[PDB]
Amino acid sequence: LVPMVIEQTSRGERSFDIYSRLLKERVIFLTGQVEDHMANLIVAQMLFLEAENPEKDIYLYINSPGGVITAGMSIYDTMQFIKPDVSTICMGQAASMGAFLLTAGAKGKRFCLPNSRVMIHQPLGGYQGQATDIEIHAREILKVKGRMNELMALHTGQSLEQIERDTERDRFLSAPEAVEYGLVDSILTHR
Amino acid sequence: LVPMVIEQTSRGERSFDIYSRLLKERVIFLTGQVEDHMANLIVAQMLFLEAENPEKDIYLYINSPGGVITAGMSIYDTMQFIKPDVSTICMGQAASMGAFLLTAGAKGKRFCLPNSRVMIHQPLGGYQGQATDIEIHAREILKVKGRMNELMALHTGQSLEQIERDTERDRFLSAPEAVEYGLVDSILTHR
Amino acid sequence: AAVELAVKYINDRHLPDKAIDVIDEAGARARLMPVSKRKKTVNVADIESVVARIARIPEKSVSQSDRDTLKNLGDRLKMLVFGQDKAIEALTEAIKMARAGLGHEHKPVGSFLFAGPTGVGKTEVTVQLSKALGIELLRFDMSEYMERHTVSRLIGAPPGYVGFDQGGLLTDAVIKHPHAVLLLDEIEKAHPDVFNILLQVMDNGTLTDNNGRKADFRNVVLVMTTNAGVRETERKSIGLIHQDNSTDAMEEIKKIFTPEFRNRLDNIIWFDHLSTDVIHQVVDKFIVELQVQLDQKGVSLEVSQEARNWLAEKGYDRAMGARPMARVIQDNLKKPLANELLFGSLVDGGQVTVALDKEKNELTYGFQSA
Amino acid sequence: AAVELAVKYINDRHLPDKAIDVIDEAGARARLMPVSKRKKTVNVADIESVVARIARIPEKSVSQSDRDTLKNLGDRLKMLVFGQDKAIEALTEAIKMARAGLGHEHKPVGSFLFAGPTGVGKTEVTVQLSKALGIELLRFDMSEYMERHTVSRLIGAPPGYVGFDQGGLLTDAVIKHPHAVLLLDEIEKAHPDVFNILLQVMDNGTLTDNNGRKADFRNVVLVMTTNAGVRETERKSIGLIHQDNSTDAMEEIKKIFTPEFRNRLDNIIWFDHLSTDVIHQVVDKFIVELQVQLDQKGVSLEVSQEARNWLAEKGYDRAMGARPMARVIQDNLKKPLANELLFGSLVDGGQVTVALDKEKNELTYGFQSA
């Protein structure tokens, strides 16, 4: 049950849920496995905040174990498109398509908590049918794989070959190791 | 169903749910298995209270049987990040990642009821697949174990060796025994 | 020194005439020595003396009499207000800095916001501070100044007033008594407009009347008592561990007072609750006050220490401050005495004793008329 | 030139007699020269002096002293107000433009709105500007003009008053000091009617009073300060990272000041928060002021760089500007010396030495009786 928090304004007092109150402060929450429905809310939230104040930065807390690759791209495409710089904070956990969004944040406004952990690996999928259909479906996984590494290399700044070999298998990176890798600029000990 | 309560104010009468009324008094309930969703509610509540009063001490009633270790770290990071001293109280049982948050409270504010029971054990996790992947996931749990022992040593003050040997197997600690170990400063029976 | 000191303190006249005023007057003082022109030559010290009289401000080179009073100021106030040593230090030290010459260039001696629970000496310390220094106390009740039209009186007169009196209650008062204690009790009750009026009073130390006269607040100690967050400290938190609630009052202070107002303030001293130990001293103060009332009638009061402790326990309430202590003394001591003073056994002077008996746990009164 | 220049500046008389007054005085000036009528003919650029003298405005062909003063006024302000360089540049450019001859035909030299956080040099930069320029500072605390009846006193006098001291406070002051700095502090508190007065000032440059006198605002600098949106600046967001609420504060400024008012303003400056490096400069400024006060008592003070840095770490608060630094100077430097000055070794001579104790992170004070 989400609690209701009272917000006091000169006009009067308005009761909002805890999540809505934080949304008013440009704080979006990316929780749970990535999906189209939950991503639509994140996308819808970014557009509303961008209009209210396109200059102000938007913060996107990220505590996710990963999820659908395509759903996350909607969020990623909306972050680069809008003018507000979308800051990203990795609270608790970040995984495939959760960490990609973390590094996708604007330069100098990406952070990780001191005890946070982040993981990265290649997209996982499968298909069953005739060999001809499996070839095209399999080829698409490579296309997104190569495209994903190009984006991560762009944000992290590392060589494409380094990400390709690292992404191949699962790699658990602690918060300090992420800074060396380039996923985040520093740790959020305090502002 | 959750009951509703009336808060008397000069401006008028406000209707709040029982949980939300307690939140107004900096009382947060950590009940149930730790998860990414419930942790965000606790995290969002901590951030909201910080804005209302960044100096007053927050309270957290821990009555959980433990859960996801990574989700709990989102709450632990926030507890030390925010300036308010997050007092912790143990209602009923406390288990892995429940006790870790119980001992993470500020010095002199951690408490336990006379009948509250605390349980501490090492993280439990399993992964199946290729031998190379098992080694990577296995090393993570070992690394996380050391972080748990290192963090608990600071709060409790005991050496890592004592915690390492004791945490190998499940250890139940009553309220008086827990005080000796250092999880909590004192009991609330008389203050 | 004449031109520098006069332009600084004498702000109502232009420099050529103003400077010559302290020169001409310093000459007359020089020739009016006790026997015959003792000091023919004039020095800077004599100029400072003349400037302090023209502006009615404390003179420099503080005599030993004032020094003794300043050093013992903290101790003297401590004998009246108990448990608020932090507030006394701010008031006393700020005064010392001003007299010593380290005061602000144009700001007042001190601007303080005494916020605390009820009956903690927020107003008694300011009232007694004036008596210690022998300066006039400018007590302004801000509950009256709750409307915008009322605030105009502080710096002017109501619109459409035809009489000659176009002065304000705050500007005129400061002009008559420039060295004084300005007390704005329960300022939070007043309309927010009053806060805007005091911004110039702290940052610049000057307030302009509607006519245009500029008051001088450089020597007027400014103290403002507020009960912000009183309901919060009264109520207990919904939790196993009761909360301090002192911080909550400060968050309300931020809401009621604009940031520019709080930034001007020298300090915001939060008065703490009275401990059981200090309540014993309060009982002695009330009894001593009762003795003064009884000495006029010719009767002397004697109260055993065991009785005083019992009274403290009967009237000791942290949330309600020290006012209940008066009620238990009034009910237990003043009520029986009044029946006798008015009707027998106390018309003429007679020693009276009040001692507690452990058996009955009640006070015993021996009038012993004489 | 006389007829054209006179109508442009001389606004208190009609054109035929006004022109002749400049021609008659010109001849009078030439004959009074010490030389035996060397400049017999009245050439151009000589009449400019007469009109400038009659109008009490700066003349053309600025002297080397004024040129040096305007060139030197790029750092001299930066030596008292640190940071906020963009605000100083706006003030100097308006002054440099007007004196150069390139300026608005009927508007003032400059109209600025100084908004920002508490404790920044919004007002100090204005006050120090008038001192650097050697011109009178016209101050107007807008907290006294919060009611409609009070605003009528600025433009003129109410009809009901029969006092001989008619005329407005702003019109009279401007006429007395045409070349001056007009400071409207806390303009947001003033009634909206005040805007109707300033709107015609920034657009036309003249405000006719009830009596009918014409006041010229061509050479008067217009600087108004405000704290609109200041609450947002000190407000902390509900998040791990505190966000910059400067953009939101500007919206509040756009709600109080109509677009027409802002459109006529030459600039709308926002004062940035004080940085750590800047604080070290601010500490030195307050330390210098302390030394000046001590010099009057023959006391010298020397503070180690380490101690200065320690005072900055304690008093540095970005949200509360630089006023907290003053409190730190009072508590750690003025208070230990006030006790010593009144009753102590520091009666005269001084030779004080302040240094940090790293072991206890507390300053050690050394007093010499000399």
Ligand SMILES: Nc1ncnc2c1ncn2[C@@H]1O[C@H](COP(=O)(O)OP(=O)(O)OP(O)(O)=S)[C@@H](O)[C@H]1O
């Ligand atoms: N700290 C104190 N020390 C000694 N006597 C005290 C103290 N506080 C209160 N008293 C006594 O109680 C009387 C009344 O206190 P008040 O001046 O009403 O306190 P206050 O805090 O200014 O009250 P309000 O209601 O909060 S404005 C004083 O005149 C003393 O007799």
Ligand SMILES: Nc1ncnc2c1ncn2[C@@H]1O[C@H](COP(=O)(O)OP(=O)(O)OP(O)(O)=S)[C@@H](O)[C@H]1O
């Ligand atoms: N940038 C600065 N450099 C040096 N001293 C400063 C600076 N800003 C403020 N001060 C000091 O702080 C005081 C000046 O504060 P002001 O500039 O008058 O504040 P303000 O801008 O009017 O703020 P309000 O009251 O919120 S409108 C003096 O004691 C100055 O010495």
Ligand SMILES: [Mg+2]
């Ligand atoms: Mg009082």
Ligand SMILES: [Mg+2]
């Ligand atoms: Mg100002």
